[PDB]
């Protein structure tokens, strides 16, 4: 499907602002 | 996950804090 | 460095596009 | 580290499959 | 609602690019 | 306002103006 | 300078997660 | 301005809160 | 349309990812 | 063309490719 | 570079909103 | 090419123009 993937693009993005120098870990469905 | 979550309601600042390290 | 966010910012979407359903870590430290 | 390698050189599609889970 | 924040986030960097150095004002619903 | 427009119909260049400052 | 666009189209995009319903306004000059 | 405090020093998403309407 | 003008967004970043030095055209429907 | 395919089925890195110059 | 890399991912951007319907090309080297 | 004018120097919008089909 790929308007899950548009949006799991921009929520990358929001994860990489908001966390910073603590990073993340991106586990899709 | 962060998909089944976050793309189906906005997220709030805290939400996004729950997914980092 | 104000430079290193943003190539940062950039590898997370090269990432993101790479991995795909395996997913990605990101630490810079 | 991710940002020592990838960002001070251009790294190429592949250089990025390594950070893969 | 998703799909809008979606739009508004590229609407925004259309915005960016359009205007430059007069810069904007972006008010959403 | 701009999300209820542009988001419903495509924007031309002149149309994204009117929001510039 | 061209590093200073790229930047500031990271700071829109940066304000526009940040301030959501309230808005955000961009003046470089 | 902004170009001048967030651009030439990371600003912090506190730092970015302080150019909202 | 407003949703494939968002998907072509991000195709045209995937595809200068994906080619690199090669370059690509890019053609809509 | 590129958009019709990949805007509504996930394209492979390969299928990226076949748009390359 | 890779800040050729980066403003060149911005450029293809713009070439996208600008150009539309016409399409461009990206020919860096 | 389009990187040795609009990336060393800040392109205007018209100056995108230019690599329009
Ligand atoms: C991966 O296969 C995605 C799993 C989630 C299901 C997506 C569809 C859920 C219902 C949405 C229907 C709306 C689209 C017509
Ligand atoms: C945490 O800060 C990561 C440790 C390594 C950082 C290296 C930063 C180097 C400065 C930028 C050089 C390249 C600019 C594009
Ligand atoms: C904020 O609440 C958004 C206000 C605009 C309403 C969005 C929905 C309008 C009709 C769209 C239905 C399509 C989605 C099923
Ligand atoms: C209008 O031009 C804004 C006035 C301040 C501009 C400062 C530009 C400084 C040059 C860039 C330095 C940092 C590069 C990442
Ligand atoms: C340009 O005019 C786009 C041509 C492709 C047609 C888009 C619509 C096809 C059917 C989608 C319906 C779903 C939206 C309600
Ligand atoms: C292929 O490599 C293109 C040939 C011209 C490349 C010029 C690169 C110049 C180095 C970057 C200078 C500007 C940094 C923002
Ligand atoms: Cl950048
Ligand atoms: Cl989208
Ligand atoms: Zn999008
Ligand atoms: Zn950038």
Not at chain 1, 1 to 29: D, I, M, W
Request: aromatic residues 14%; hydrophobic residues 30%; charged residues 10%.
């Amino acid at each position: 499907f790929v308007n899950q993937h548009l949006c799991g693009s921009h929520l990358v993005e929001a994860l990489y602002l908001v966390c910073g120098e603590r990073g993340f870990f991106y586990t899709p469905k | 996950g962060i998909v089944e979550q976050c793309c189906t309601s906005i997220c709030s600042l805290y939400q996004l804090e729950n997914y980092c390290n």
